Amino acid sequence: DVQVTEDAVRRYLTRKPMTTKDLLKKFQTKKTGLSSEQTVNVLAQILKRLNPERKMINDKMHFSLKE
Amino acid sequence: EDTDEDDHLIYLEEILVRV
Numbered sequence: 229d230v231q232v233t234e235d236a237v238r239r240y241l242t243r244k245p246m247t248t249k250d251l252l253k254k255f256q257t258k259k260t261g262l263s264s265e266q267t268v269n270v271l272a273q274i275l276k277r278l279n280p281e282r283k284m285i286n287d288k289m290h291f292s293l294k295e
Numbered sequence: 296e297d298t299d300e301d302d303h304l305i306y307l308e309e310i311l312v313r314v
Contacts, residue, residue: 247308248304248307248308248311249301249304249308252304264300265299265300265303268303268304268307269303269307271307272307272310272311275307275310275311275312276310276311276312278311278312280312282312282313289308289313291311291312291313
């Protein structure tokens, strides 16, 4: 039952950039038990906490950092 | 029904780093 958290998204970035859709789509209600919409309602808040750099991954808008 | 799942998906996309 993974939960969408600030610290959880940081690991996603340092590992590989992501888009809001791609960041939330991965979580999904599969385990977090969070609706496809709610998962976003709780992901949007954490996204900004990342404070990464905007870039296009494979022609896709991806915001993230790279250690 | 009107699957408005992506509707907000783009809205929150801006609040992040796409204002």
